[PDB]
Amino acid sequence: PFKRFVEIGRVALVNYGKDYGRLVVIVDVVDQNRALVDAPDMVRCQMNFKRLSLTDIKIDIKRIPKKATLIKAMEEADVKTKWENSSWGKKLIVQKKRAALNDFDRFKVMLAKIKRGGAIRQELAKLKKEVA
Amino acid sequence: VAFRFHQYQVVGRALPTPGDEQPKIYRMKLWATNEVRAKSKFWYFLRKLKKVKKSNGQMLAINEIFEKNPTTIKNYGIWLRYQSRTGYHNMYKEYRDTTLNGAVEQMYTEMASRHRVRSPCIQIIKTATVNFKLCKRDNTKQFHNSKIKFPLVYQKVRPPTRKLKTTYKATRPNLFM
Amino acid sequence: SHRKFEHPRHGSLGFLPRKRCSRHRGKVKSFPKDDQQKPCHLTAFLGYKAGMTHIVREVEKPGSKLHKKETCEAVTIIETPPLVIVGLVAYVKTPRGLRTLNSVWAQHLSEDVRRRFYKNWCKSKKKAFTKYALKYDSDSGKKEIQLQLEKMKKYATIVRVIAHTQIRKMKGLKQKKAHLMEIQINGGTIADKVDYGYKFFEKEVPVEAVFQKDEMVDIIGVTKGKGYEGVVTRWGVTRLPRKTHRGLRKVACIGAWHPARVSYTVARAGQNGYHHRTEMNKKIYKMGKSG
Amino acid sequence: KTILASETMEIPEEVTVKVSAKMISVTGPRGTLTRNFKHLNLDFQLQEGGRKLKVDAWFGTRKTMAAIRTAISHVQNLITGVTKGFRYKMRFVYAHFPINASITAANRGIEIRNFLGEKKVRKVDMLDGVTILRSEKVKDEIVLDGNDIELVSRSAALINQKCHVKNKDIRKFLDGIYVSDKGAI
Amino acid sequence: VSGSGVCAKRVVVDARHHMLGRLASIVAKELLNGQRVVVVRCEEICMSGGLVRQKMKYLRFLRKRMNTKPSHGPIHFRAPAKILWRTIRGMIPHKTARGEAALARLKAYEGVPPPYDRTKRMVIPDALKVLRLQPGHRYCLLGQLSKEVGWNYADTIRELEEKRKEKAKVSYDRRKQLAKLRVKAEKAAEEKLGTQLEILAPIKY
RNA sequence: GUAAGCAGAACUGGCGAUGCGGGAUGAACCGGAAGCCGGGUUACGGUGCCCAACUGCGCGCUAACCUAGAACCCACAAAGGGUGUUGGUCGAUUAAGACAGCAGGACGGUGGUCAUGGAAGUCGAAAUCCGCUAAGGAGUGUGUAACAACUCACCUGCCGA
RNA sequence: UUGUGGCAGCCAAGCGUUCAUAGCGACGUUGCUUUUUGAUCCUUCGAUGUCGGCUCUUCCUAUCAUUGCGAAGCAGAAUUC
RNA sequence: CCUGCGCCCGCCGCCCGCCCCGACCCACGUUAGGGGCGCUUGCGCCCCCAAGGGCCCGUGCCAUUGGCUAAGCCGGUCCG
Ligand SMILES: [Mg+2]
Ligand SMILES: [Mg+2]
Ligand SMILES: [Mg+2]
Ligand SMILES: [Mg+2]
Ligand SMILES: [Mg+2]
Ligand SMILES: [Mg+2]
Ligand SMILES: [Mg+2]
Ligand SMILES: [Mg+2]
Ligand SMILES: [Mg+2]
Ligand SMILES: [Mg+2]
Ligand SMILES: [Mg+2]
Ligand SMILES: [Mg+2]
Ligand SMILES: [Mg+2]
Ligand SMILES: [Mg+2]
Ligand SMILES: [Mg+2]
Ligand SMILES: [Mg+2]
Ligand SMILES: [Mg+2]
Description:
Chain B is 19% helix and 31% strand. Chain B has three helices and seven strands. In chain B, strands 2-1-3 form a three-stranded antiparallel sheet, covered by helices on one side. A three-stranded antiparallel sheet of chain B has the order 5-4-6, with helices on one face. In chain B, a hairpin with a 4-residue loop joins strand 4 (74-83) and strand 5 (88-97). By secondary structure, chain C is an alpha+beta fold. In chain C, strand 4 and strand 5 (98-105) form a beta hairpin. In chain C, helix 2 (139-155) runs antiparallel to helix 3 (190-198). Chain C is globular, with a radius of gyration of 25 Å. Chain E contains seven helices and five strands. In chain E, the strands form two sheets. A three-stranded parallel sheet of chain E has the order 1-2-4. A two-stranded antiparallel sheet of chain E has the order 3-5. Chains in contact: A-B, A-D, A-E, B-D, B-E, C-E. The A-B interface holds A 2-8, 15-17, 20, 28-32, 36, 43-46, 49-50, 54, 63-64 and B 71-73, 96-98, 143, 146-152, 154-156, 158, 160-161, 176-177. Strand 1 (6-7) of chain A pairs antiparallel with strand 7 (149-150) of chain B, so a sheet runs across the interface. The structure holds magnesium ion (17 copies). The site of one magnesium ion (MG) has 2 residues of chain C, from loops. Chain E binds three RNA strands through residues 1-2, 7-9, 17, 21-22, 24-29, 32, 49-50, 52-53, 56-57, 60, 67-68, 88, 90-94, 99, 112, 116-122, 125-127, 129-132, 135, 137-138, 165, 168-169, 171-173, 175-176, 179-180, 205. It is classed as translation. The entry lists the keywords ribosome, translation. Wheat 80S ribosome stalled on AUG-Stop boron dependently. Chain A: 60S ribosomal protein eL14.
């Protein structure tokens, strides 16, 4: 068995191009290579399956929804916040934030992990000596 | 973005002669990559069908036809005449695309692929939007199925941009469909 | 331009280059494949060709015309006094091939075998192994020698004994410098092989413990040397007519115009004899043991 | 080009099928049979708790869709070999010279003699699952039985092609050992 | 292919299930660019087209020899590491000083000898079989070709790898335990420090 | 002239007389013609390595157990084949049961016949109707010198797509 | 270059006591080869020693025998593709 | 075996020459699948995309004058 399918209502990441990082909803499949994808911020358009990545989220719709019906069903299944808090969808968000640390921020993080690094080692020494 | 091909109405007639101050006006729907190539192909058919050459003729109007509903999926039929290495043939095709411009681009591609036929050798007789329930080809029909579901059996492994390209990697790529 | 009449090629291309051997002692280029269920035996000796003579025997071979008849046969006598085992060598399998892991020598080495390590024995100090000998008289030294045995038992895939001849017992050989070689131990485990070899250091091996009666053996050695020889005797090509200008004993054509080179297959003049050879299935007719 | 091609087979309830990556191990009263299907590029899945084995080909061609029923056909032979087993039969066919078949050891080989009056002795061992026994009831038969239909069939074929007639017109010298009944017991 | 651009002292590449030609092409440009490459497990390199095509290709190669002096002729290597080295040499200008220097920077081995077993082994995605070959198209292993053309050290390479792979797996388990107690340490320290680590919460994954 | 990197003509251009970029290499093939330099951009041709430039973005076709195939000139391959595979065109059969496979089945005016030493059909075999029916040629070989049934096209039973 | 020389295909009227294709293959037609000759005159006339044999080696396959097979107008023996 | 006036080894006194600039990091295996963790030993849980990660006073004019110093970490050296 597989755990991800191209189908109606499946939400898929756009994993290549100028539009990298957006969630879209597959609303109809044109052929074996091209999908028709609609997201509430964009004009429904056909995209290739090579430029997408199927996620784990699904929403409960008909073929070719109406934008209002699409916007509704996204929130009813809570698409955005699920993507944002799961590990796959959080890796994207942090990797953006890590990019936006200015120099002084990178210094104060550099201070934080040196202190945290010391905590771990002295914590880890006490367990290593307590257990034999 | 741009479509490689565009649909044009081209309108033209013979030159007014000392008789026939109102020669008859002809129109076609043509496919070409710009207006200039559209006008040139108009005068091709009108020399060999209606016996009016560009020299003795006159160009009246040229307009681009666009798709009314680009956001929806239409089925399409194309009736085409082509030349092989040993003669001429008629061929019919089904395509699925959101615009008829997209449908034509696939057709030229599959003719150059499945038959090694070049664009200067194909004449499009008739184009249509064959509604489903009447599509003939089996490839087009298997997509006329709500509850359509299939996996991605081929999936490209590639960074979002070349900025993140490396040559070496610690672990093997992790793939599952 | 095909040759008019055909005949097989003269000489064998399989024994090239026909150069002088780089060795005086024959080299064992392959040992019998090992059979771990056999007991630990040796696989080779060093003998000295004494001469030839002939027997007359009577045959038993049903179906042959010689059945119940006599026959006369040439035989060669090889004098094979006992070997003396002085050392042990271990081998380990590596991706490139076989490799010597380590080696242990006996405490006492005769003057004959120690002559093997010098090119002028008499004016040297005869120091070879004079310090390795002291490893046998201190408990730290004995510890090493014993530890080296453990290493062979632990990792070796092949074990060989070092043995020398008692060259001094053949006075007809005006030689004092013994011949030394490695002889592989087949059979038994590596632990069995190391025990068999070390247990039997400084001692003598008769030819009986290795070869038996009526068994087939290969004989290895270097053939007689004949100096620089022309093509007729070296390769066996035919002589040319009597009336040839510049000589009969040659090869008339040494190649075609193309390739514009002389090929390695054509017969040339050069060294004849003193070549390494392995000769198979020489049968053993009689073992002669003193006493 | 076909989106989905799939076939299903039922699994009898006195045997148990354990498909791992594409290793279909089958176990039942007679023994265990295993086979490697890693070469197929299909999708195997037990459904209803082992009572059906449903095999899948996504976007296959005609050549690739040909594999579905072969794998299905194979797994049947693994099922039926573990309940009933397989048993081939061979007749001895000869014109003048009787052929003297003799077992090698514990029904694990045969030793065939006098075939076309030749002095040579023909040696052939049975493969792992196969035992061979001369038929007690029929004039000149040897009966091969085992779990794996393929190992039984190779043993039958081994004995047939080891009695080929050479040098002679085989439209008249029909002598040999041939497969009579190829059924499944 | 321009080059990695890396400042490593060397790059060890585990060539298992790479494509010989694609791997050789990547490695060749790296050597020209001044980098040093170690390639291990060359017995595991893959070649598209089955064993039969590759055997035929190699036996056509055995035919090529200088008729008048075969020892001078083309030198046909059997070991996979030497098969890899000659394929790379084909992709380098090896008759110049620059190409001689490039080939010096390459070491190729069958299996994973020391010290490269306790070193991290990188993979080249551009040449991996999973990404370059369509499942259902014939291929063979460079170890398999060598076995059938006269390489007599297949088994010794196999013996050595099993002992290494076993020796590496217990190390896997030893780090597996050490990873878990360190993880529990992570929590236990990160609760000892409260707000003091607040700056790390939005940049962690 | 069978032809030839052969012989002889017509128009134009090239080489000869000319370097330079590409065609791996070449007098006349493609681009393009030139003082000695800096910077920019192109043509032909290319962008996995050799080798400057993407292992770039797309869609199909090909799997070679013959050295698969891969550069205008240009360094060939033909007539003829393939149940390899992929697309088309013209027809057909199909729930009124199609194709395959398995068969009880092919019977009655009828050997009126056709061979007066042989044949509703069966060494052979001119040839046209009719009786039955969901139905079956007064049978090209179903093989019995000859009335016996399975194996053709023609309908039935079995199958259900 | 390939007329001529040599080898090989396709179609199938007939032979093969009946049967086009076991083995053949007329009238036609498509090729390959470069040990012939012819055609040409590009290289060499301030010189590349010009028949044959002898000697020696190597290479090709369009396979005569030897190994393993397939077909037959193959009973066996022999013979043929 | 290892040059009787020839050489070898070990410690510190360093001075050049050389490389480098954080020149830090070991699972196997497959990819029509796999990984970590608990308990039926298979089931649950969570994770699967790239080292795009982790680690490291990572912060002193290749690095100021002196003293002191936990716990922790890194080097040399001793032994096993
Ligand atoms: Mg000659
Ligand atoms: Mg000859
Ligand atoms: Mg002689
Ligand atoms: Mg004279
Ligand atoms: Mg480049
Ligand atoms: Mg001139
Ligand atoms: Mg410039
Ligand atoms: Mg075709
Ligand atoms: Mg000719
Ligand atoms: Mg001719
Ligand atoms: Mg001339
Ligand atoms: Mg001339
Ligand atoms: Mg001349
Ligand atoms: Mg001269
Ligand atoms: Mg001259
Ligand atoms: Mg000359
Ligand atoms: Mg041949």
